[PDB]
Amino acid sequence: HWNLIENFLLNYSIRLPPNSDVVLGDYFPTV
């Protein structure tokens, strides 16, 4: 159920300016 992790991450990265390419390092949900 990777889509659960993906949806979390997409919602988390909702404040990235237009042309963004960045590595986010945090205490993110794991599998």
Q: Footprint of ligand NAG on this chain (CB under 6 A)?
A: 7, 11, 14
Return the sign of the alpha-carbon dihedral for residues 13, 17, 20, 26: negative
Q: Which residues contact 17 (CB under 8 A, 6 or more apart)?
A: none
d(C-alpha 26, C-alpha 8), whole Å: 13
Nearest residue (CB) to ligand NAG, 11 versus 19? 11
Min separation Cβ 31 and ligand NAG, Å: 18
Q: Measured from the CB of residue 30, what is the shortest distance to ligand NAG in angstroms?
A: 19
Nearer to ligand NAG, 10 or 22 (CB): 10
